Structures are given as structure tokens and as C-alpha cells.
A = this chain, B = another copy of it.
Amino acid sequence: STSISSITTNTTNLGNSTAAALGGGATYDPATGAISAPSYTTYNANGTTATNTSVGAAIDNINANGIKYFHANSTDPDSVATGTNSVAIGPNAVANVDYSVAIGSGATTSAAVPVASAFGGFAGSAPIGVFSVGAPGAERQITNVAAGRISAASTDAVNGSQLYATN
């Protein structure tokens, strides 16, 4: 009788503390023993959100569709980053060269080639690694590039209008 009272008090503490730990608006109802389902919002890649009613569904959505501000629309193999401090972003991206980035579907990394001259005094003649936007035969056109400084010191990229102008 005191034992019964002890149990119901304890199961209410169990219920409440499980509900607290879950968050997402979960609540415990001592009348039924039920924790109301949590609601966890995840961000789809198409400008919409999903409501998840379990932690596992939310975790799965995070991997399948990304997080807010970081979306890759794919079902293809995961990116692979094995280079030291390397970053691989998008389906089938591979960043195996150290201190490098592969970004874009199927992007790969190969070793940087130092270029000091070809015309001398090039800035950024000693690359730490590569920043790849694609792969051989699968190149990407880099777009919306502001005009870069044209100077001996400049490590800004140059755009097509600048090459147009010099010619």
C-alpha cells in the first residue's frame, strides 16, 4: 500500500525525467503511463521541414537530407574524406589528398602542382592542397566570381571579363 504509493511516485518521476530528456514537447501522463510523442523538426532540401516523431527518424532525416543551410540532394554514395584535415562534400566526392577539399557530386582530389612561373613572380606558388570543384571530364564552371585584384601579390581568382579585357 505504501509500496504501491512508492511505485506510482517513482514511475511518475521516471516518466517525467524520460520526457524531459527527450524534449521535443514530450510530456508524461500519470493517468495512462504514456509519454506523448516528441516532435523534432528536420530540414528537407526542397525548402520544407519534416516533423519527426522519434529520435531515430530525425537522425535518419539529418543524414538523408542534410541540416539547415547544408543540403545535398542525392541518394548516391556518401562523400569520402581521408586526407588529413580534408573536406568532402556531396555524393561520390572524394578528398583523399591532405589539406584539400572535394566539393560537388563526383569531385575528386589530386596533388597540387606548385606553379612559380610559366612569366614569373606568381603569388600562391606553394599550395597547401587543392580545392576541387569536380573531376577530369566532369569539370564545373565556377560562376558569379567577382573581379579579382590584378597585381603581383594577388591570389584572387580572375573572371572571364578580366581576361576579355586584357585581350
Contact = CB atoms under 8 A, between A and B. Distances in A.
A59 B26 CA distance: 14
B55 A122 contact: no
B149 A158 contact: no
Contact of A141 (B43, B107, B112): B112
A39 B166 CA distance: 59
Interface in A1-21: 3-4, 7-18, 20-21
Count this chain's copies in the assembly: 3
Contacts of A24: 54-56, 59
Contacts of A84: 73-74
Interface in A115-167: 115-116, 118-167
Interface of chain A, main secondary structure: loop
Contacts of A150: 115, 118-119, 160, 163-164, 167
A47 B76 CA distance: 12
Interface in A71-104: 71-74, 76-91, 93, 95, 99-101, 103-104
Contacts of A85: 72-74, 76, 90-91, 105-106
Q: What 6 A-B pairs come out closest when comparing CB atoms?
A: A23-B56, A154-B160, A23-B54, A10-B33, A134-B144, A13-B33
